[PDB]
């Protein structure tokens, strides 16, 4: 279920949104974890450097990897619940 999507992004920065959306039919997390993880790594990597458009410093998380674990964690639970409870993960045998 998705109703809010399209004209909703207060930030002038996007080259051919549709194109940016042009990819494997969103659904599988395989690319989410793969890509996501990769990106994250990048972000953090860059985050390290002070000078380079960045302003991340709050709480007792004076770390990267660690902060990464806690982040991915909250993101995991949050994602899993996707805001609204959704019983569906992997009904294995």
CA distances from 53 to 27, 33, 46, 47 (A): 32, 25, 9, 9
Whether 74 is covered by a domain: the verdict is yes
Method for this entry:
NMR
How many Cβ atoms from other residues are within 10 Å of residue 21's Cβ?
Answer: 10
Whether 10 is covered by a domain: the verdict is no
CA dihedral for 11, 79, 88, 26, sign (positive or negative): positive
- Give, for 78, the enclosing helix (H) or strand (E): helix 65-81
Number of domains comprising the chain:
1
Tell me which residue range forms the domain holding 54: 15-84
Whether 3 is covered by a domain: the verdict is no
Rounded to whole angstroms, how far apart are CA atoms 65 and 45?
Answer: 10
Whether 54 is covered by a domain: the verdict is yes
């Amino acid at each position: 279920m998705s109703t809010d999507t399209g004209v909703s992004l207060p930030s002038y920065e996007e080259d051919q949104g549709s194109k940016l959306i042009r990819k494997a039919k969103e659904a599988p997390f395989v690319p989410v974890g793969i890509a996501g993880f990769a990106a994250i790594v990048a972000y953090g990597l860059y985050k390290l450097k002070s000078r380079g458009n960045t302003k991340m410093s709050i709480h007792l998380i004076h770390m990267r990897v660690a902060a990464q674990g806690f982040v991915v964690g909250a993101m995991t639970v949050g994602m899993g619940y996707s805001m609204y409870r959704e019983f569906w993960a992997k009904p294995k045998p």
